[PDB]
Design a protein around this nucleic acid. Structure first.
Ligand SMILES: [Tl+]
Ligand SMILES: [Tl+]
Ligand SMILES: [Tl+]
Ligand SMILES: [Tl+]
Ligand SMILES: [Tl+]
Ligand SMILES: [Tl+]
Ligand SMILES: [Tl+]
Ligand SMILES: [Tl+]
Ligand SMILES: [Tl+]
Length: 95
RNA sequence: UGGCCGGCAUGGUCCCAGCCUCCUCGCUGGCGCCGGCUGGGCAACACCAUUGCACUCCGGUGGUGAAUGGGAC
């Protein structure tokens, strides 16, 4: 069931008490050094809360981030990271 | 009061201060007691449920069942 490499990483187990806008800014803070980020998609709906899609421009970036930040304490919770199942439209509209 | 009716108590006007609050956060809002009818919203705050793969915002419930004193005429 393991996913294949993707420009986008999927993060979950994120503290749900954090507002969308702050969450996006914070995530960008810790993940930017891995490479250019095209966007970070967060939502608070029942189905999507506690998860986020950080979309990296280059898969290598999505790969260090995934290995380097796995389990990183963030807002008191261990961040769980994977590769997103399919592509993000921002990436389709290019690659 | 978010919108509305009743009961009771209470002389008036004004100044200061404190305080209160989901629905015009303040100095031309309110701040004796009690019952009842009933709308919006989850934006903020709180709580319940949720470990969930998206690229259209989008689960639920709760709060006003609130808050005092002094002074000048
Ligand atoms: Tl009311
Ligand atoms: Tl009355
Ligand atoms: Tl009097
Ligand atoms: Tl009086
Ligand atoms: Tl006031
Ligand atoms: Tl009443
Ligand atoms: Tl209501
Ligand atoms: Tl819908
Ligand atoms: Tl008084």
């Amino acid at each position: 069931p393991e996913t294949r490499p993707n420009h986008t990483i999927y993060i979950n187990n994120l503290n749900e008490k954090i507002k969308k806008d702050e969450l996006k800014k914070s995530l960008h803070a810790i993940f930017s050094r891995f490479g250019q980020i095209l966007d970070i998609l967060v939502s608070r709906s029942l189905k999507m809360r506690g998860q986020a899609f950080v979309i990296f421009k280059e898969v290598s970036s999505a790969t260090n981030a995934l290995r380097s930040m796995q389990g990183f304490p963030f807002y008191d919770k261990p961040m769980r990271i994977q590769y997103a199942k399919t592509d993000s439209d921002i990436i389709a509209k290019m690659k």
